[PDB]
Paper text:
Phycobiliproteins (PBPs) are accessory light harvesting, water-soluble and fluorescence proteins present in cyanobacteria, red algae and cryptophyte.
Three such αβ monomers join to form α3β3 trimer and two such trimers pack in a face-to-face manner to form (α3β3)2 hexamer resulting in a biologically active PC assembly. Altogether, the N-PC hexamer consists of 12 protein chains (six α- and six β-subunits) and 18 PCBs adopting a doughnut like structure in a manner that all α-subunits are sandwiched between two layers of β-subunit with a gain of −486.7 kcal mol−1 solvation free energy. The N-PC contains three PCB chromophores; one is attached covalently with Cys84 of α-subunit (αPCB1163), and two chromophores attached to Cys82 and Cys153 of β-subunit (βPCB1173 and βPCB1174, respectively). The pair of substitutions, αTyr18 and βAsp187 make an additional H-bond between α- and β-subunit of adjacent αβ monomer within trimer. This pair might provide additional stability to N-PC trimer assembly to maintain light harvesting under extreme environmental conditions.
Numbering used by the authors:
A (entry chain J), B (entry chain H), C (entry chain L), D (entry chain B), E (entry chain D), F (entry chain F): 1 to 172
G (entry chain G), H (entry chain C), I (entry chain A), J (entry chain I), K (entry chain K), L (entry chain E): 1 to 162
Write the structure that this text describes.
Amino acid sequence: MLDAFAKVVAQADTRGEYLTDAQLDALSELVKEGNKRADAVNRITSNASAIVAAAVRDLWAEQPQLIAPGGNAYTSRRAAACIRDLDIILRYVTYAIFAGDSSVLDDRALNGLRETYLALGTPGASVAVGIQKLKDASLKIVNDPNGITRGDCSALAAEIASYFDRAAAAVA
Amino acid sequence: MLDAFAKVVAQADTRGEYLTDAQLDALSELVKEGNKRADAVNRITSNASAIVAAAVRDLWAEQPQLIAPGGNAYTSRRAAACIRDLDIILRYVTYAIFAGDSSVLDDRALNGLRETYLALGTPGASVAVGIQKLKDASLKIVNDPNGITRGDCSALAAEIASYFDRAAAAVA
Amino acid sequence: MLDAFAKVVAQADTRGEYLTDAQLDALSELVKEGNKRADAVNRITSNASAIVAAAVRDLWAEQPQLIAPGGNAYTSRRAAACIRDLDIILRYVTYAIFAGDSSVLDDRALNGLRETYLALGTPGASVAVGIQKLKDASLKIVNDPNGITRGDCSALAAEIASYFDRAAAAVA
Amino acid sequence: MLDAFAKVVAQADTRGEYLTDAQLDALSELVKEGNKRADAVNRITSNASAIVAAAVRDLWAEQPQLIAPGGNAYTSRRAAACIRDLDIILRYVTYAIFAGDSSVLDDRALNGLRETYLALGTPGASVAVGIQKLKDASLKIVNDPNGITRGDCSALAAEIASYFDRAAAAVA
Amino acid sequence: MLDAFAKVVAQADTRGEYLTDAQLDALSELVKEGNKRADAVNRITSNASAIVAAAVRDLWAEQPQLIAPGGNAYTSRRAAACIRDLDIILRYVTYAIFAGDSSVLDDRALNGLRETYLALGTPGASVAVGIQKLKDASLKIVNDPNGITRGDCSALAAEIASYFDRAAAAVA
Amino acid sequence: MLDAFAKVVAQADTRGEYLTDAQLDALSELVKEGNKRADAVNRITSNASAIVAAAVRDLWAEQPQLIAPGGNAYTSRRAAACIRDLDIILRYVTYAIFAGDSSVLDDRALNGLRETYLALGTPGASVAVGIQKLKDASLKIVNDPNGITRGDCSALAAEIASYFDRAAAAVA
Amino acid sequence: KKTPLTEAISAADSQGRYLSSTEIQVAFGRFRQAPASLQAAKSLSANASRLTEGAAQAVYNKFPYTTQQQGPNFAYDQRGKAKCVRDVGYYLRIITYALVVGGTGPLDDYLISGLAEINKTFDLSPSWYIEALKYIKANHGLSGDPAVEANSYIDYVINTLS
Amino acid sequence: KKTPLTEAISAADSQGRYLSSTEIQVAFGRFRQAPASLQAAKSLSANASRLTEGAAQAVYNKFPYTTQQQGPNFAYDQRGKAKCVRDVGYYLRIITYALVVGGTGPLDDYLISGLAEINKTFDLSPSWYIEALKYIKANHGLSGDPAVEANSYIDYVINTLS
Amino acid sequence: KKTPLTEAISAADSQGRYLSSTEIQVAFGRFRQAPASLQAAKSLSANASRLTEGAAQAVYNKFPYTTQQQGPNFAYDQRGKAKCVRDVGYYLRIITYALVVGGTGPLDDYLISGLAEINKTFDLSPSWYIEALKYIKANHGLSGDPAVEANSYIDYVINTLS
Amino acid sequence: KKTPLTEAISAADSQGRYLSSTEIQVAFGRFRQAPASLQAAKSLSANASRLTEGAAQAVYNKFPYTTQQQGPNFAYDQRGKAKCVRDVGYYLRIITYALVVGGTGPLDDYLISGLAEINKTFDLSPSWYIEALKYIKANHGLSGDPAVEANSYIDYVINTLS
Amino acid sequence: KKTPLTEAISAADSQGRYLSSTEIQVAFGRFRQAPASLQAAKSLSANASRLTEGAAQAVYNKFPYTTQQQGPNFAYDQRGKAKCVRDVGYYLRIITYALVVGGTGPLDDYLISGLAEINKTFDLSPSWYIEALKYIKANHGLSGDPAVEANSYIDYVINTLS
Amino acid sequence: KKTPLTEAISAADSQGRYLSSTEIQVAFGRFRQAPASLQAAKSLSANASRLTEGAAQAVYNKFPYTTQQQGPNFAYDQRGKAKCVRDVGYYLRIITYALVVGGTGPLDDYLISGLAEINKTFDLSPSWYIEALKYIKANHGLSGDPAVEANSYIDYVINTLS
Ligand SMILES: CCC1=C(C)/C(=C/C2=NC(=C\c3[nH]c(/C=C4\NC(=O)[C@H](C)[C@H]4CC)c(C)c3CCC(=O)O)/C(CCC(=O)O)=C2C)NC1=O
Ligand code: NA
């Protein structure tokens, strides 16, 4: 729905105001760091399957009750649906990185996801841990200093981490 | 869904009774004033665009916070939607006049509109004022002595005003 | 959705265990009396029209205000709708008898029925009596000793009652 | 789609001309005969179940190979479909009489019916015989001199006959 | 639509005749051999993936232009679609063996299939070579003398061959 | 559906070949002129309403029988439909400019358009004239030397002209 | 609740349209006819008991076995006879409703929708009620337009029953 | 059309599935039951003449007005009685078809679909054929499983007529 | 297309049913009204030249720039004026068509559908035609029912343009 | 809503895909165009008063009747002139939003959706706003790609008004 | 879920139909097969441990790299080997479930749905599990009808794996 | 089929509008990146022989059983190896197509759609091709943006196989 430029535009329209020079310059700073952002999308996307696979593997190893008979992630269908849920969250987080705004994550993935898990009996706290594992693996891949023009990506990696945390807080 | 005749028929069906002579004569009275009823429908419909425009123009003049940036009626789409709501209410009211029964207004326009405006953030009391202006403009057009056989329409006028007040009371 | 065999399997999978020898023998003895179950299904199905017609007839004789003018089962549409509801429940009961399990009756027939009768204004309690009369006629047809190999169907007849009772309960 | 008045209007627009005084007086002549036209619509409609039943009965008595085993009208489903076809055709003919124009008959009923019966294997010429019997029964009922203000209806009866003949020609 | 029994019934209904004693006895003979019929269904179904995989493998090795760049079976999507066609055909043939009638093969799989391949650019004669290879492999599995009560399956085997040859001839 | 790059790639895959050095340079020569291509799209799109309005106005002036009573472009619905058609063609032509390939214009707009007009009675030859007016006005706007970095666009102009001539040839 | 006025409204509402002079003329035609329609309703109601008892009697005379065969669906006894005159009274009353609103709405909604299911379920012959409706037509004594319109609703039910 | 075998196929095809051991058990059930079904069909066919004339006569006794009242729908003339025997012979013959295939397919497609509109249009009482069917059940003389399965189809048609 | 008669047929056919006394009353009302409408159209036809020439003249008087500004959308030249009086004649002639049939169908089909796109594309202003229609209402000189029904069609067009 | 970045997301999400290098190329040209187009909204914002006041007067100069015709839709009085200068500022401000997000989203959501309904209901001519828009394009003083992209948005609104 | 009895119910319910002799024959053939299926189930349960250990070992001997390559998907360590024997037990236990219910339902619902997604996400080769199912087929020692119905569900899983 | 330019067109067409400056910026980013792409595609085309041969051998190196096990799916014989080199050549060639057009379109239509069915039906392991794609990424020798975009298509295919 909104990228970083539209969110400021949407706020200004409710005021009936042109963007201030500070608002325009701030958006210019985002544009200037856009190569880093594109790398973050590319690097997480280019590793999505591995990141999701490692997330369910590490989650189910830390919580074997999830996969034990009767567990919520037991049976092939529910194990696959659990992998799917983490893959969907990661995809919508990459959307939010690309846009510099969380609206697509909030509106399409996270809205009502807590209630959905409750209705199914899926441990929202266990989903949050899986998302935390999605985050750690994705950040280490973004911060990988190999095969890339070295620079400072700490502000972008802080922004990326907040999308994961936001998703985690929405299911817990 | 129901006109004045069907309303009486349905009430008689619950009793399993034939219509009495007083009821047959009451409905025969409404038939006799059908020409006044058609004039009222024709006259309101014939000026429907001007009536609505005047209702939103005067409402917005009295409540400029509706059109001001950030207002509920701000932007072209919400301004049009506001014009559309009052035109919708005016259209169903002419249905009710034509039918001699408010069920079409209640069943298709008023039912849940109070809760719809609450979910949208539309000030329902402002809508009611806009309906009151539809009513005042409509009654002036109905009671216009020019270009019509002069006669008594005060009973029809009071029936029309109750339809508008019903709609106004349903949104506040 | 489930028959008696799938229900035991579903509970054993949640424990990740094979079926014990006793559980297999218990399901074996259910198979050994499958002919009685086939009769119970065929006898009720073969007489389904008479059972429904007797059920509504005695129900409306016990509760005349149901069919009196204004009644919930007055007019042809409501009278046919009332007949249809008992016919639908009777069919879903014979579904449960066939499966030896109440899932198909619970999932597809009783799920949300009490709410529906409340949204409609239909007397669940009157519906519960019609169901009980469906049970009454059906059980006397299942237990009829003529034209069948003489034997003991008491256990099956107890099972058939609980399905009807299950349906009556969910509407009161 | 069109009635006798709209037909003339449609022809007038393609020439961009007003209706001449002659064309208006002709249309006014149709209005004067409007009660006879209502009698034809009401009389055929009020007897349509008997008209159709007489038509299929006489047609089947005439062509026993249609309802004999292996026939197009054998089995209850195809017999009911054959009955329904002659009913559908009669219904649209009543429309054409009411409109004073055969466009509703042509556009909605007859267009493609020949090709439809060919794809089915249904003898269209046998349908034409059934349409002739719908015409004969309907005309005798329209020209019934009892219970009606006696007058000349030969012109309307010719018009009605042209609609049936138009339908009989279009099925094969 | 039809099995072997319904096929004889459909022909008897068009004649308006009961089944003859000979016709019944023939159907009673198909019932006595039904176990072999079930083995042929089970055995083909149990090896369907290997039968299809060997059908396309031998076809594409015999006609390498089909999988060569630009050929009809080239690219992963078209190679998969070609596998699906032979898999679908084999699936409908097993329906035909199970029913003792080819109507399910004709009505659903073969009807218009020739023309479909003509409008797709798919060599129909190549499909027929693929179908012939489904036939050879299937019959070798149906006639496998191991792990089954020994007997005579030659007539059933000849019926199975006619189904494949019927489908091969429909696509050429 | 295809741009200029996919056209080359699709043809290469049917041959199963990598693109040659000359092909890659030829495509690279096109990408270098991307800014002139983007100007032609922007310049035509920015003037589309005026381009179409001039086209239909000049066409109807040259062929007044199209808008005379009875003509194909008479009445407001047909007049507006004719305007939309020229605007639809112009839109799909700017698609082709943008993509450097006419497939989007051929597949989605021109395919079967002549047969559609013949079924409607719309003079295709008159549409061709209307297309030629779109073409003359578009090229004059594309080749405008004012307000743009002066250069050579003759090659692109010939390409744009070929899309219009192709559109005209499809309907004439 | 299908009347000339509700049909006009529903047609205009389904197209999102205000009422035009087209629908105004529908009301004119309805009000032009309503005096005759109400007059038929007033006469039928006043003669309700005579028409109903006579229509039920015409059925007994036409189908005598309905008073001789012993079954729930038959008027062999006084229970059935009460049911039968009640049924015939339902038909006539809802028929007067159709005249009051000038439309088949009351017939469709209160009488006809589901009628074949009730007759089939309770083994009631449609011929029984067609005979009763015929007797009402021959014996209501209405003339002119109130007769023609009354008989069109009587024949409307007869058509649904056949 | 609806048989145990065709329904098995139609369920597996609607899910894009090959036939599994579930549908094979359907075939086993059909083949175990087929000799009893084929027994009933052979017996009904051999006794079709006396069961058909006998059933139509049971209707005439139960409802004497059908051989008495004058109308196209009635068997008061020879034309009517011929039609009646034909109808009963249709019911019985299509019932034997159901037994031959082990399912209601032939009954649904050849007899029941559209039956309500036919009986309503030609003023044929469902009650007439219910009595004919009751007579067939009480007189076909079958025993064991063939009687049970035959009666199920007889009661199937009766259920439809009520 | 949309007339009292066709709407009655369309409503019934969408419900797959015969016309009843409801639709007859629609035809009775249309036929009761047709005469004063048919003669309205006869008056508007005879006075079309005077009404349309004056209607355009009224627009020029209120909006003088429409005869001065030199653009193709304007009546500043002989060509512009001819287009304008031509438009006004189209409006009027189709309005009389609506009177002939007793419905807005001709207005909807020949005039109003796509009209908003025409006025937009060619920079024609809706107030120009609203003012022209106001002039026609004030000067057609009709009286009684014809004036009322004609004014409803005039205001129907005005309602579309605003 | 509609920007280069949100359109790329919307495409990938509707197709259930992660973003690919296609979408990343969308952000590349868009981050290339932004720095300039951004400063090119800082210019339009700093000059908004002059451009708006100038554009409104240019409408008055070309259509002087808008300053004279007595009616609420016109600028014959102070209230009318304030409403006009307000509107012109709405166009310009939302056009600058379109420059800020590099897409028509703000124009579609805040200005154009519902605009035809607005201008029809309040009798506001699209030709007034086209002229205003033409003045902005002629006097905003922008150069290079900033001018071109801003002019594409100006002609985007002009295109929906004509 | 998918059993001969639930399929019979699901088919009848999708057609709004009571059960008939068709579905009764399904229960018959199913009650004929039951003793056989349950026998294979009781034996496969007692032998489950030796079948599961031997099937995994048969994979190790056919594809020795599965006990050598050092990765999470492999059985090179004790953890892997335990996961592997766990998976074979899942296949075997759910196959016995299929025999108990006489249908593929348990296999479809507990094992096959989403199975292909898991094997690809976790780099588990389908040839590993096919080879294990082949070991079970050739070693359960079943005979008669229990053998071939057990092998059908085995070959059922093998088909979804290839 | 899916390129930045075709995605731009498909989006605008499905919204029924002209290309705006949004889709123009798409072309800017595409034409800006395309020299890096057509650059990487010219090198991969020249090194295709040594890259596909080295990728095929690297698969054999990490999965030596593929050159050892007997069966059509394996490269134990020359035919198998030729099939493997040919497959890897398809992957690499279509990956170049994706570079040439700047999108995954060719990968989706010629390579990936139906691929899992192919790899299942012919017992081809996805891990085999993942290692071949890893070798290509490790040996194509590209640098700068050509390497980054080439690797994103390689990893696109890796993501589909896992
Ligand atoms: C397709 C139509 C069809 C059906 C439905 C059918 C059912 C059926 N009922 C049976 C008998 C039997 N049937 C019953 C049933 C009962 N005995 C009573 O007194 C109770 C009233 C009633 C309880 C339901 C009993 C108890 C037996 C003996 C034990 C048994 O076989 O189950 C048998 C075994 C053979 C026989 O003894 O008759 C079958 C196959 N056969 C068919 O051909
Ligand atoms: Na204007």
